[PDB]
Design a binder for this molecule. Structure first.
Ligand code: NDP
Ligand code: NDP
Ligand code: FOM
Ligand code: FOM
Ligand code: MG
Ligand code: MG
Lengths: 408, 408
């Protein structure tokens, strides 16, 4: 039985993954499950699946160990990055589902790559932060990356077999891949003024017309930073530069992305917007399996809309492409500044529209710019340099926010 | 150089094929080209490409041989089925593009199958008439069939590698194919009353909003018999029964068909409606090549509409599925009665809406029904039995038309 370790098991992507597993018992073994703050949920999950290991936050280590023994479970409890890395590199784990949010997922994804694991990547921030190093390390050590991100899974499904195996084949012109097309819902402020976007409450920003997701990706969807990060993710996943990857607004969230070929064929994946489809595809690959989604009814669709991105209004997407052109240092600055600004938005400290301001200022910061030319792709010193650069951006983005609330 | 024989070179599909060839001269050799009534066009094509053989109609044999020698060309002239069969089975021919319209294309397609050729099938009537025999014969003799028909080429592009090679693999549930979805423009009378459909002139029926095609497929598009024939073609091509193949109206002619998988993924081919895309894909397979189409601009699409087929209004599609369920005898009756009724419509003898009447009456005819149980799939006597049954249907459909213009 394919052995599974699920990182970020307590969150949104955690839920859909687990929902597939419950439809397919005796196909997968659950070896490990991780959470951070939701101890009780993690416990509940441990009692249900009886995993060999689980990992929680350092502040919940003791408490969770006590509850686990009180429940009479044989399960090992771990904590912090330490435990994630152990689980990600664990010898008895066949497949790792990387669904931790944000930079926090970086070390363990990198560890699964280092251990030659089959990796199901939801955690898009870890490739924005360290794409060169992640991919290099995977190839070096024989790890496989299947994308879980909906768009990237669509693109992956719509690419030839040879290129799924080896992303570099995309540059052989026989295959005739011309460009990739990323679809974006345009989030909940697509048909709203800039005025209403400033005034947005958190409830308005966090809720999405078509998708039910984690908090952060919800805010990113509203600002369109999500597509920005997806732009960089696609770059590393399919070994392209930003010029080969374009973006179309599509509010229905039915078409999930396209690959354009030289003969004029656009191969696309369509589906009801539900992460169980991409997750199910990646779990069973090369096979397929029922996912438990309510399949798309083509008779009841109506009009699928398409539209050019309004880049004044969704400057995050502008900035993301700008950063993609500058390389990894600027992609770290993009991502981390974004994490800090989103935290500030959710904490009712800035306006939704200030997220773009903060992120520009950090991209255009001289102190940050100085780091834009290091070897973040170095297999021995690269990690240390990404984590250091991350700390610096957190410091400056925070300062930037303080400054903005008065004047610069 | 891949050697090419083009059957139906003077027609619509002929034009697009040839237009690709002119963009790729150092890639294919033109070995043979065929036409029927357009002698001068065929001659013009012979002077341009200098083919080894050409074939025309029996009544133009002499005339065309005279003009060919007067032009100083070394090209052999052939005529009738005789010549088509010679060309289709010619030892120096690598690939055959079957783009003759109607049952007329049957013997030569069957001959290319019998000779183990790579075959690019536009000619959908020959598989409606003799699908069992064609496919059996191809597999027996090692012929390859790539679909040129737009919908089938879309479906083919959206299917896994293993199944492209071997259509039978589709029944292995690992691949998780659930059903196929055929898109239909709904022709030029989609948003018009039944009254206006009766009164339709030939000019109204023959012209199509999105496609420029031969006369017959144009009338079939207007009545939706085209999708009916496409339904049966898909059945034999991808080895399914009609229940696994469904139909959606899509007036924009951008999405050209879909394959639905068990996880909820719909893989689809999108493109501007232009047969150079499917033709180019089939010619270069497994590679790809520029086709000379103006590629789809996603920014300028607007609304892609989808809708259930109105089956009272497009009874041909009802009748086609009915025939598909009854098997080959009834598919011959469907197709041939359709040929005869379309000729009658174009000759200003029946109303557009009478095409469905005629075709039902022939499907429900006792004299025809008696033949619905023969072995039209027999490798030694099957052909004779299809051609005989064809002659009978032509006779009865004609009578049916005479009767209808007075009363039954
Ligand atoms: N539909 C979706 O939700 C989609 C999500 N993604 C991506 O998948 C990833 C997960 O997103 P999503 O599930 O929405 O987010 P959630 O906020 O719902 O889930 C986050 C998960 O990671 C854990 N986590 C949070 N902070 C830390 C930390 N500092 N250290 C270790 N673990 C932590 C959480 O634990 P706890 O909650 O127990 O504190 C939870 O298990 C993201 O990278 C997102 O961009 C991609 C496409 C679609
Ligand atoms: N876009 C399109 O046009 C599409 C076409 N198809 C299919 O492709 C095939 C060709 O259609 P299309 O190109 O539109 O039709 P056309 O009417 O343009 O062309 C028909 C071709 O076959 C020849 N032909 C006609 N009658 C006979 C006969 N009795 N014996 C031998 N040859 C004959 C014609 O020669 P001549 O003209 O010199 O008489 C011509 O070369 C059809 O099977 C159609 O269903 C499928 C999808 C799209
Ligand atoms: O993979 C799924 N998502 O990233 C959710 C997409 C929301 P968006 O279209 O507004 O980026
Ligand atoms: O392959 C191309 N065609 O069959 C032309 C399609 C016209 P329709 O959608 O009305 O059948
Ligand atoms: Mg996504
Ligand atoms: Mg067609």
């Amino acid at each position: 039985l394919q052995s599974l370790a699920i990182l970020g098991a307590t969150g949104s992507i955690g839920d859909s993954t687990l929902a597939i597993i419950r439809q397919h018992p005796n196909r997968y073994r659950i070896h490990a499950l991780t959470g951070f703050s939701r101890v009780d949920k993690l416990l509940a999950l441990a009692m249900e699946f009886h995993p060999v290991k689980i990992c929680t936050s350092p502040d919940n280590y003791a408490q969770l160990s006590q509850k686990v023994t009180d429940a009479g479970l044989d399960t090992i409890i771990l904590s912090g990055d330490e435990g994630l890395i152990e689980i990600a590199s664990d010898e008895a784990v066949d497949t790792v589902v990387a669904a931790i949010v944000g930079a926090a997922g970086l070390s363990s994804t990198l560890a699964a790559a280092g251990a030659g694991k089959r990796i199901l990547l939801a955690n898009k921030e870890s490739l924005v932060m360290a794409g060169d190093l992640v991919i290099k390390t995977a190839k070096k050590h024989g790890a496989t990356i299947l994308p879980i991100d909906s768009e990237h899974n669509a693109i992956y499904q719509c690419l030839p077999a040879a290129i799924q195996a080896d992303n570099t084949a995309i540059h052989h012109t026989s295959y005739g891949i011309k460009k990739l097309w990323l679809t974006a819902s345009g989030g909940s402020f697509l048909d709203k003024s800039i005025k209403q976007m400033q005034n947005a409450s958190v409830k308005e920003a966090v809720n999405h017309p078509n998708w039910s997701m984690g908090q952060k990706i919800s805010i990113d969807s509203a600002t369109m930073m999500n597509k920005g990060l997806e732009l960089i993710e696609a770059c590393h996943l399919f070994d392209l530069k930003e010029h080969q990857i374009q973006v179309v607004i599509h509010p229905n969230s039915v078409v999930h992305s396209l690959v354009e070929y030289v003969d004029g064929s656009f191969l696309a994946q369509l589906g009801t917007p539900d992460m169980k489809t991409p997750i199910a595809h990646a779990l069973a690959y090369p096979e397929r399996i029922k996912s438990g989604v309510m399949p798309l009814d083509l008779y009841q669709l109506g009009s699928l809309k398409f539209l050019a991105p309004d880049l004044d209004k969704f400057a995050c997407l502008k900035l993301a492409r700008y950063a993609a052109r500058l390389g990894t240092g600027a992609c770290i600055a993009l991502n981390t500044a974004n994490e800090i600004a989103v935290e500030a938005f959710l904490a009712e400290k800035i306006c939704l529209t200030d997220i773009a301001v903060i992120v520009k200022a950090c991209l255009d910061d001289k102190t940050i710019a100085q780091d834009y030319s290091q070897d973040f792709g170095d297999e021995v010193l690269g990690l240390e340099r990404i984590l250091t650069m991350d700390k610096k951006v957190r410091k400056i983005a925070t300062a930037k926010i303080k400054l903005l609330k008065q004047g610069d």
